[PDB]
Design a protein. Structure first.
Lengths: 49, 22
């Protein structure tokens, strides 16, 4: 939750959580801009789940 | 720019602009 996947291979590096989630979204072929304008809705759904 | 949180005010360089003057 603190450093994403960086610590898996070497020394951990701090990364903001929305920044990490942007990389996760981009990893499945979606432009990273989409996440920014839906952050509140995404957080609400995640909390409910 | 009214939706994203944390944006900043900075300039963007245009490489085409210096080529137009000539």
């Amino acid at each position: 939750i603190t450093s994403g996947w960086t610590f898996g291979a070497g020394p951990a590096l701090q990364i903001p959580f929305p920044m990490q989630m942007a990389y996760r979204f981009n990893g499945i072929g979606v432009t990273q801009n989409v996440l920014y304008e839906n952050q509140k809705l995404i957080a609400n759904q995640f909390n409910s789940a | 720019c009214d939706v994203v949180i944390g944006i900043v005010n900075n300039t963007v360089y245009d490489p085409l602009q210096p080529e137009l003057d000539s």
